Curated annotation (Swiss-Prot), chain B:
Function: Capsid protein self-assembles, with the help of the scaffolding protein gp11, to form an icosahedral capsid with a T=7 symmetry, about 61 nm in diameter. The capsid encapsulates the genomic DNA.
Organism encoding this protein: Bacillus phage SPP1 (Bacteriophage SPP1)
Name the UniProt record assigns to this protein: Major capsid protein
Subcellular location(s) of the protein: Virion
Subunit field text: Interacts with the scaffolding protein gp11. Interacts with the decoration protein gp12.
Length: 323, 54
């Protein structure tokens, strides 16, 4: 058909392009990390492959002073040690196309299919991490200091409960940046409050703002239902700075192959990456595997945290939607 | 069959320690107390040690 950079498969000149555009286009960003610690490098790249390491830490000395008084002596004190974990995950999928369609629309090879696949993974992470918090951080007594709800049919989501939730970190404020928002909410928001369209990029328009924050319109969210048609939403609020990840490399990032007896040709991607909040430690219990983790069971149960209280940093409030 | 990751040996990993912080931010300075006068300069150093003057 054409020069076919992918269909005659130049593996160079292509894969770096795809990865980078995948990074910039997707947002989030930021919010979350850019270029996390090389810790996740040593977990990602070869050599010393996964699964994940464990890294330690020394909590700070603490204790009372003692009465300094003669005719008595002192007693010394000690330090402790602690543990931390991460995970590693793998992904991939195919494409069933016929090169007739792929470069039918594609035509000029460079921008077309690359831009597409980029936009693809851009949504993929947005699905995976946003699923990663989901069960864990909500289900425990251990985080409850970070969850408050107005639910059970008195609460409005406006102008007050938002503030109080935003102060659920007592001393530490003004580290928070982005507000995760499902659509219908922000609908109820434009219906009432002052939510203020702010134009930064000159000249471009614009990312919406609530109060010195960046709200984020996001399609896929949790939602539940009770009887009596009453609804409940989640809408995480963090803008922490940050989560973390590092890209890492597989072998054969791009592969082109075809089948003689039928008529097809297909594509594959299969990228590695390492992402996890630091944040709670990860463990192994009562799960399948391994590795990588999962989706479902990579959420449903069994995480364990140690810091604790501050510098997590994420908070959730389930609120009912305004009448 | 396969190369089959199940049957090949995986190492594990570590890397250096990092100090952890404990947080309750202690400032409550400046305030009383701060920026002292010299009366206590007379009650601190030797000679003529404590206890307190009047």
């Amino acid at each position: 058909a054409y020069t076919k950079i992918s269909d005659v498969i130049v593996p160079e000149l292509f894969n770096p392009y795809v990865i980078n555009t995948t990074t910039q286009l997707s947002a989030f960003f930021q919010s979350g990390i850019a270029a996390t610690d090389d810790e996740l490098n040593a977990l990602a790249k070869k050599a010393g492959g996964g699964s994940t390491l464990n890294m330690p830490y020394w909590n700070d000395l603490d204790g009372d002073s003692q009465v300094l008084n003669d005719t008595d002596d002192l007693v010394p004190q000690k330090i402790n040690a602690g543990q931390d974990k991460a995970v590693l995950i793998l992904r991939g999928n195919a494409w069933s196309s016929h090169d007739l369609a792929a470069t039918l629309s594609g035509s000029d090879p460079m921008q077309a299919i690359g831009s597409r696949v980029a936009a693809y993974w851009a949504r993929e992470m947005q699905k995976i991490v946003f699923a990663e918090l989901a069960g864990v951080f909500s289900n425990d007594d251990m985080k409850d200091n970070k969850l408050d709800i107005s639910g059970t049919a008195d609460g409005i989501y406006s102008a007050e409960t938002f503030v109080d939730a935003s102060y659920k970190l007592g001393d530490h404020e003004s580290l928070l940046t982005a507000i995760g928002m499902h659509s219908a909410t922000m609908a109820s928001a434009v219906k009432q409050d002052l939510i203020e369209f702010v134009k930064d990029s000159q000249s471009g328009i614009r990312f919406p703002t609530y109060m010195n924050k960046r709200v984020i319109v996001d399609d896929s969210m949790p939602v539940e239902t009770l009887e009596d048609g009453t609804k409940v939403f989640t809408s995480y609020l963090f803008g922490a700075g940050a989560l973390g990840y590092a890209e890492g490399q597989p072998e054969v990032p791009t592969e082109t192959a075809r089948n003689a007896l039928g008529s097809q040709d297909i594509l594959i991607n299969r990228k590695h990456f390492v992402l996890h909040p630091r944040g709670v430690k990860f463990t192994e219990n009562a799960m399948a595997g391994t590795t990588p983790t999962d989706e479902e069971l990579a959420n449903g149960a069994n995480w364990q945290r140690v810091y604790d209280p501050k510098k997590i940093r994420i908070v959730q409030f389930k609120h009912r939607l305004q009448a």
